[PDB]
Every structure is written in C-alpha cells, then in structure tokens.
Ligand binder design. Structure first.
Ligand SMILES: NC(=O)c1ccc[n+]([C@@H]2O[C@H](COP(=O)([O-])OP(=O)(O)OC[C@H]3O[C@@H](n4cnc5c(N)ncnc54)[C@H](OP(=O)(O)O)[C@@H]3O)[C@@H](O)[C@H]2O)c1
Ligand SMILES: NC(=O)c1ccc[n+]([C@@H]2O[C@H](COP(=O)([O-])OP(=O)(O)OC[C@H]3O[C@@H](n4cnc5c(N)ncnc54)[C@H](OP(=O)(O)O)[C@@H]3O)[C@@H](O)[C@H]2O)c1
Lengths: 248, 248
C-alpha cells in the first residue's frame, strides 16, 4: 500500500538522511550495505520506523547482485517507485600527475558502473508500468573543475551524462530521471575530521557563497523533491545543492 | 504571524496557482494586478482562503509604485518572507529582422526592469533581517535559442543574470535567490488558443521529450520548493520545469 524506494546505502551520511526523509513521507524504504552485520542496527538508527524498512546486502559493483537484489525487491513488494543512487566513493590523492590508476578504477566501478547497473535493472521494471523516479547523486565537481578532485569529478560528470541520456530516452515512458549536485556536505565522516582539529570548518565553508557547509538534510530534501509523486514535469535536470557555488 | 509572500500577479495563469500553493501551505499571500477591479474577484477565485489574501494594485514597470507597495506591505505585516517575480509578457512577431523595437522595450520594461525593481526594494527589507527568499521566473528561452522568441528569450536570459548576480551578492546575508525555467505551460490563455484551432496540443507538446505540456501546478510546486523554509542551501540556481527540454 506504501510507495517503495530503493537507496543504495542508508546506514551513514547522505543515504541515512535520505532514508529518514522518505520514511517521514510514508514510504516503505529498502536500504543496503555491503556488510550484512549492519542489518542489526536498524531498530536503533531508525527507532519508530523499523516496520517500514527492508535490508539488502549489496555491492553495486557486482552487476549480477544488483539484478538479483532489484528482482527480489520487485517480487516482494510488486512495485519500485523510486531508485536513489547514493553509493559513491572519493579517493583523493594529490595533483593529477600523482594520482593512482587503481584509485580511478575504483571510483569508476562504484560511482559510474554501480549507478549504471542500478539504473539498468530498475528501468527494466519501471518501463513495464510507465512510471517511476530515479535520482542520481553527482557533485559540484560534476559541473566544474576542482583541483585535487579531478578524477572524482570525472566520475560525477559521467553520472550527469547517464542522468541526462536516460532522461531523454525514458521521457515519453513517464519516468523522471534527475540528479543532485551537492557542495561540501557535513557528514559524520567530515564532522570527525573537523573534530580532530586537522580541518577548520570555516576553511572549507568559505568555498560556498553562503559561507556554511551543506547538511545531509539539504541533500535529502532535494532528492525527495525530485522523486515524489508531485514531480510530473522535471526530468534530465541537475539540481545544485551547493550554497551558491555553481552560480559564481 | 503567518509567513508572508508577495507575488507579482495571482489572478491568472502561473501566478494564480502559485498563490494557491502558498495558501495551502499556511502563508498569508499578497497578490497583485494592474487593474483595481480584480480585487472583487477574490472571494470567488479563492473561496476558502480569502482571509489569508491581501490585494495590491501594482504595475511592475513603475519603480515608484513598486517601492510604495513593498513599503506598505512591510509596514502592515512587519515581514516579507518571499517574493515571487511572476509578472511577465511575451510579444511574439516573426523573425528577428521583422521584430519591433517597441515590442522589445515593452518586454524589457516588464520582464527585466519589473523583476529588478521588485528585487531591489524587497532586498532592502530582507537585508535588515538576514533572511528571505526570492524566486524569479525565467524560461527555457532563458537558457537556449528559440526561433521567433529571440527577444523574449533575451529578457529571460537577463532575468537569470539578475538571479545569479543577486544570489552571489546576498548569499552571506542568509537570503536565497533562485529562478525557475518553465517549458511550454498550459495556461488559460494557451487552453483557448488550442480551442480556436491555431494550435494543436500534440503539435506544441512535441517539443518536450515528455511529449506533454507543463501545468501551472508543475511551476507552482517548483517555486514553492525553492521558496520554503526548508531551503537552507539552494541559491543562484535555475530549476528547469520543462519535461526534459534543456537536457537535450
Ligand atoms: N560528502 C559530500 O560532501 C558529498 C558531496 C557531493 C556528493 N557526494 C556523494 O553523495 C553520495 C553519498 O556520499 P556520503 O558522503 O554520504 O558517503 P558516505 O557517508 O561515505 O557513505 C557511503 C555510502 O555508500 C555505500 N557504498 C560505498 N561503496 C559501495 C559499494 N561498492 N556498493 C554498495 N554500497 C556502497 C556505503 O555502504 P556500506 O559502506 O554500508 O557498504 C555507504 O552507505 C556519494 O555518491 C558521494 O560521492 C558527497
Ligand atoms: N505560459 C508559459 O508557457 C510560460 C513559459 C515560461 C515562462 N513563463 C513566464 O511565467 C510568468 C507567468 O506567465 P503566465 O503565462 O502565467 O502569464 P499570464 O497568464 O499572461 O499572466 C500575466 C501576469 O502578469 C501580470 N502582469 C503583466 N504585466 C504586468 C505589469 N506591467 N505589472 C504588474 N503585473 C503585470 C498580470 O497581471 P494583470 O494582467 O492582472 O495586471 C498577470 O498576473 C511570466 O513571467 C511568463 O513570461 C510563462
């Protein structure tokens, strides 16, 4: 009876807040981790929402598993209203000439191929019912040049390419496909790097015109807006959630 | 007491639906017309919301009147949470070589100067309280070249310039300033232009990848999202509401 959303992730950072936002809006939420040990955290991370959450172990770089997991979800729930491609990694070295090819391949595998696999199998099902929403997560580095994050940015550019291409291809099938482009977001990972003193909050906050960091809630709200049933006419679009970064 | 929004318009087309959207979300709404006689329509257009609506006669091309009306609103309500620059005109002729300078100046006056005047005086007030949101209405023609709508397109490009410029300028002052870029929207005006027979619906909807026209609700929903209290980190952005038009 509830709309059903799959988030690649859900246990930390942006993904957890995305899960919470859909839960607060009466969705059934499928969340994932590579680690089966995370399933037991559910009643404690999402106190009152436990009954509306389903766990799946999933590595998005494993195409066969992506197909299996999405098939399982469709079989169990008989619907797949929304896919949120949250899973992503950033392996930041130094300048381009010092970067490791193994790092770039890992980012490609997770950020590009993982998003591609999830789209590919989600769309096979969404096509049949001529409805659904996909929201991909890019970055400001997906729309501009960012020193020391060139390779990550390249993958996030590629994500935008998958978003716009798929959008145009599936536009007449009533499926919406959009992306968000967050600026620097204060996740748990960043908060502890600030708390360990070796990273000044104001130092990184200053790259945004708004002179503050983004929150996981800022991102979750944008994703929810693009995904919900009241989105009838927005597709192929990249929503910047960046404190004004891309406008200068 | 209630959040207060000013819309330049409110009696027809996109502007009416924007009023309705803010009303449904518990705002007090100031709506305007150049024509004082429209005020008596309010109990009939907005049956159950009449108590939460205030009428102001306003021509946005008259800078003195813009300053007067915004001052009167702030004096009476003691707040101005949101400004929506809805007022705009399209005077289409033929190719660029056949266009009338008088038509261009009219569009410049309403679409560029009107938006600028309202921003200018709204920001003098919002600056004082370090909060507020402005949503401007541009167009897909503000982000692409559109034969036979070159002059209108030029004014809507200019709107984006005002949007991005002010966003960066006021970002550190807590004020959000964004725009929407709608595709072709089925308003009352368009509905009857299809009814006359000069246009087929399928004919003009075919320019959008989604193969349908946008609605006034589509636009109102996008505007509300950018304007509401839960937008903390989106500024300087142009939200496309165009059935995928700009993604091709
Ligand atoms: N943080 C930022 O400032 C920022 C800015 C712009 C964009 N983004 C993007 O936003 C998304 C979320 O970032 P975040 O900072 O919230 O990340 P995070 O806190 O590091 O969490 C990463 C999430 O992705 C999952 N994941 C990673 N690799 C996976 C794989 N191979 N298969 C399945 N799941 C995998 C993790 O699941 P398990 O570890 O439980 O398996 C976890 O849920 C990413 O795409 C990121 O690039 C982040
Ligand atoms: N319709 C579309 O497909 C479309 C697409 C992209 C963008 N837009 C833009 O969206 C906005 C609304 O369009 P719409 O189609 O809803 O327009 P509409 O139905 O023609 O309504 C025009 C509105 O603008 C007001 N207005 C016009 N000139 C004014 C002036 N000099 N001073 C104050 N108010 C003035 C009118 O008020 P009174 O007549 O009551 O004085 C009315 O409320 C415009 O900026 C338009 O360019 C529309």
């Amino acid at each position: 009876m509830k709309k059903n959303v799959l988030i690649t992730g859900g246990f930390k950072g942006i993904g957890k807040q995305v899960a919470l936002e859909f839960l607060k809006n009466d969705y059934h939420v499928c969340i994932t981790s590579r680690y089966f040990e995370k399933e037991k955290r559910i009643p404690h991370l999402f106190s009152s929402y436990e009954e509306n959450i389903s766990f799946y172990q999933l590595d998005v770089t494993d195409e066969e598993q992506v197909n299996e997991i999405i098939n399982k979800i469709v079989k169990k729930f008989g619907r797949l209203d929304v896919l949120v491609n949250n899973a992503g990694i950033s392996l930041s070295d130094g300048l381009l000439t010092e970067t490791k090819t193994t790092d770039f391949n890992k980012m490609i595998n997770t950020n590009i191929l993982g998003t591609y696999f999830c789209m590919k199998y989600a769309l096979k099902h969404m096509q049949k019912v001529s409805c659904g929403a996909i929201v991909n997560i890019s970055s400001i580095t997906g729309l501009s040049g960012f020193p020391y994050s060139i390779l990550y940015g390249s993958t996030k550019h590629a994500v935008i390419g998958l978003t716009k291409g798929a959008a145009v291809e599936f536009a007449d099938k009533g499926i919406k496909i959009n992306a968000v482009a967050p600026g620097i977001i204060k996740t748990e990972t960043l908060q502890k790097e600030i708390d360990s003193g070796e990273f000044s909050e104001d130092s990184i906050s200053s790259i945004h015109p708004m002179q503050k960091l983004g929150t996981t809630l800022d991102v979750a709200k944008g994703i929810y807006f693009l995904a919900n049933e009241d989105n009838n006419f927005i597709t192929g679009h990249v929503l910047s959630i960046d404190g004004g970064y891309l406008s200068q």
